[PDB]
Design a protein around this nucleic acid. Structure first.
Ligand SMILES: [Ca+2]
Ligand SMILES: [Ca+2]
Ligand SMILES: [Ca+2]
Ligand SMILES: [Ca+2]
Ligand SMILES: [Ca+2]
Ligand SMILES: [Ca+2]
Ligand SMILES: [Ca+2]
Ligand SMILES: [Ca+2]
Ligand SMILES: [Ca+2]
Ligand SMILES: [Ca+2]
Ligand SMILES: [Ca+2]
Ligand SMILES: [N+]
Ligand SMILES: [N+]
Length: 389
RNA sequence: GAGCUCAUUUCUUUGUUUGCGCGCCAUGGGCGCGCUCUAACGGGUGUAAGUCCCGAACAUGCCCAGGUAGUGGGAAAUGUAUAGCCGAACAGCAAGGGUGUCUACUGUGAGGUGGAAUCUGAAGGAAGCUGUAAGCGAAUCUCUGGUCCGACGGACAGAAAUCGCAUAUAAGGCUAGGCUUCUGAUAAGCUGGCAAAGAACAGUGAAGUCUAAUAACUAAGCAGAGUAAAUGCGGCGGAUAUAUGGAGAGAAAGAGCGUGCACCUUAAGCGUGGAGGUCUCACAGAGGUUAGCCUAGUAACAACGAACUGUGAGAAGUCAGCCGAGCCCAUAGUAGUGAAGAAGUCUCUGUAAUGGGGAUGGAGCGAAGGGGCGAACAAUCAAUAAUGUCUCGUAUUGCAGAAAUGACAACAUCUGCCGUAACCAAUCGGGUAAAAGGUGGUCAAAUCAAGCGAGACGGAAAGGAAUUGAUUGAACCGCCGUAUACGGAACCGUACGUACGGUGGUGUGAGAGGUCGGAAUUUCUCAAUUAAGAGAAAUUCUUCCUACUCG
């Protein structure tokens, strides 16, 4: 029980509080905010410290209150280094210095190694199907402290930053079995795919690993979405895969259901009847573009960024033309952006038909690509080339 | 540049002048009555032709094709070509109105007046004027197409308000494509990538009806992509003089002018009125200074400061539903209205609500804008002995790990085809725990048992199952009924048009735009490549508005 002191050492408590206030969490049903635990940890810090050391502490019934979140962070920031030396190298889900892009690159490395038959595994409702007793004794093989059984019990049948770590302990046995059988895999947390060399070997691996997960782990495989694929019809962590006509290189790409989400968010951010300034639309669109590129910066989006840049500039021309709002102002702003007054007056009295008018000619020349890049709109193609060509 | 394609309406609104009361007047409408006309101009049928019927010159539309245009012909359609109506999102004139600006006069001043410049002269009364393009142009009756309406409300609650279904990780429409299967005329309307409504232009185009004439020359289905300030489809009922597209009857009315009517009505016309507040001046008081000079500053409040308050004479000047029944102030019980008849009373009959007649009555009824009090409405807030548990022992059970010895060499797990094939990755026949194999032995545990719990048994801790009073509703979006006007019939609008009555919704921020007025910069023109200047054009800033978009 000497680990319990490092769990409740006050520097780790203040670091957990810093992680909470930088996390900016939300209150639960009780209604206690992240602001208020300074005086509450002054008022009740000895109370909760003694209550945890004497094994009597109350749960919360979604989003937990920030005291339970804060204690969960305080125990998960010390339970993690001791569990890092046992975790597999191809486990990338909620670990320090590990992200989804590492999983995609390792997937491509194994994919180009010669294992291009994918055993996609979908676990059905992960945290609602794990037996608490097997998970808790799995913790109890290497951990001196068992106070986590109160959270595990009375928050499921009644998460924060302890539940993904416990998910990683529960799937670490699966990862050890995969290394035991000599199978290659990549695993984000409860999102794992096996790569093997042939069809009927992939079916054998699917049957045996579903057998192992159901019997010797205690969770059920969702058999309706566990599918033996190729890396051409797989959606893994938002990335689809394809085969290049280069030598033996499989390449990643954003999946069509991720491009659809980006296009939906782009169409929302460039709605022409959105009553904010076009500087604000350009700012939020740059935030969305800049957050969507550097997650998919691995993989090929040359033509996709070209098409999306063209669509973004078309919708921004429509937004600016709708915001000009009158044929007099459309004519004036068209003249002072370069167009002659006769052509600008003919175009501006087609003020309606916004989509036709912003498609071609005078508005396409006036609101140019340089006029939109100097406006502040970063281009998807040039940003993608700047990050990873 | 969007995706070889690709070149667009030189337009107006929903959004910013005015919006009060009372009175007058039609140049508007209603009902009469007269006088003229009415189908290119002629004929016929006839008692009666505006109606019914027949007659042909040539200009456009369309066809005849001759890449397109020009000569020669031909089938429908239109015009010249009905009396006459109307006047464009067409011009011109324009009485008037606004201006913190420039200038002359005037007043002690608040201000006023006349000019100059500029905006405006409007969808609600100079019932503005003039000239048009285009459009229209005959009672009724039947059939039919299109459109619109049967509120609003993302179409729910509500409400007096057509039904049903669908509709925002977007119905639906539309634009540009992709793949398969494959005779025209009239012309309301529909659509043109979507806030929605109209105009322009273009393409199409329902229902009927008409026409199948002549001569040649020089589209549907299918998946997607893109695009929305949301409605779409069907049933039922109604309207339809933009004199709605037509078809059939129909000897049927239509138009202009004049004139009557204690006939009706209108918001920018004409008279008149103007409080409450806001300023200006002069007197008195209240004071800084020793009755003599000053009385404001702080948008405003609060609060300092001598700087406050009356009285009189003046000046500009109002005037929009948002939650308001009623009362108070002052113009004011005055203007106005009423004896061709009020208030009050009775009676009859309507609406969801506002009402409308009839009898009696013998004289009252009665404004304007602004502010205050405020019943009420909407929202938010405040005052007003069981179970389960607490802690001790008892019997346990969930899940690790270690393993005396048995039973089977059979269970797991990982690479994953065979033949034809002169060589096929189901490119060919099958099959996907297919061949051929590699690796770990597998299971049961007699016992032993960590750590965290979990419900049971027993004895001692216990506990208990309306009103009043405040604050907010700043500012808006509409919609419907009746009366009444208009743009542009419907739709959409004119501050929800306005007046009264009824009914839902948004919530004090940001953005975008418009802008009477002012200031500045540039590009010109002007002289002569002088003028701080005159005529401008463009842009920016400022003043004002938030009806618009999003929350
Ligand atoms: Ca309006
Ligand atoms: Ca004409
Ligand atoms: Ca509606
Ligand atoms: Ca659609
Ligand atoms: Ca016609
Ligand atoms: Ca008028
Ligand atoms: Ca006066
Ligand atoms: Ca109000
Ligand atoms: Ca309307
Ligand atoms: Ca107005
Ligand atoms: Ca409005
Ligand atoms: N006004
Ligand atoms: N309104």
């Amino acid at each position: 029980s000497n680990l319990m002191e490092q769990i409740l050492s006050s520097d780790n408590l203040n670091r957990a509080y810093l992680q909470v206030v930088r996390n900016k969490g939300a209150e639960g049903v009780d209604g206690m905010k992240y602001t208020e635990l300074k005086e509450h940890l002054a008022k009740n810090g000895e109370t909760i410290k003694g209550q945890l050391r004497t094994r009597k502490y109350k749960p919360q019934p979604g989003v937990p209150t920030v005291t339970d979140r804060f204690i969960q962070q305080a125990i998960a920031q010390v339970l993690t280094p001791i569990y890092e030396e046992q975790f597999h190298d191809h486990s990338y889900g909620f670990r320090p210095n590990r992200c989804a892009q590492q999983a995609i690159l390792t997937a491509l490395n194994i994919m180009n190694d010669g294992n291009d038959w994918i055993v996609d595994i979908d676990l059905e409702k992960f945290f609602d199907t794990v037996n608490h007793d097997k998970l808790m004794t799995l913790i109890g093989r290497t951990i001196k402290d068992g106070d986590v059984i109160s959270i595990v019990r009375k928050y499921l049948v009644s998460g924060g930053n302890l539940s993904p770590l416990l998910a990683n302990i529960m799937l670490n046995e699966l990862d050890k079995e995969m290394e035991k059988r000599g199978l290659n895999f990549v695993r984000y947390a409860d999102d794992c795919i096996i790569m093997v060399g042939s069809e009927m070997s992939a079916n054998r691996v699917m049957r045996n690993i579903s057998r192992f997960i159901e019997e010797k782990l205690g969770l059920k495989v969702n058999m309706t979405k566990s599918k033996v694929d190729r890396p051409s019809g797989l959606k893994y962590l938002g990335f689809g895969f394809y085969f290049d006509p280069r030598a033996h290189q499989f390449k990643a790409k954003p999946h069509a259901k991720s491009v659809a989400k980006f296009k939906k968010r782009m169409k929302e951010l460039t709605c022409r009847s959105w009553g904010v300034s076009n500087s604000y639309k350009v700012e939020k669109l740059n935030q969305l573009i800049r957050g969507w590129i550097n997650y998919f910066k691995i993989g090929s989006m040359k033509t996709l960024c070209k098409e999306l840049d063209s669509r973004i500039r078309y919708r921004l021309r429509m937004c600016i033309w709708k915001q000009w709002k009158t044929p007099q102002n459309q004519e004036k702003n068209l003249v002072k952006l370069g167009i002659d007054r006769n052509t600008a007056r003919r175009v501006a009295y087609t003020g309606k038909r916004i989509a036709y008018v912003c498609n071609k000619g005078a508005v396409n020349v006036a609101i140019s690509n340089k006029r939109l890049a100097s406006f502040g709109l970063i281009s998807m193609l040039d940003y993608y080339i700047e990050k990873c060509v």
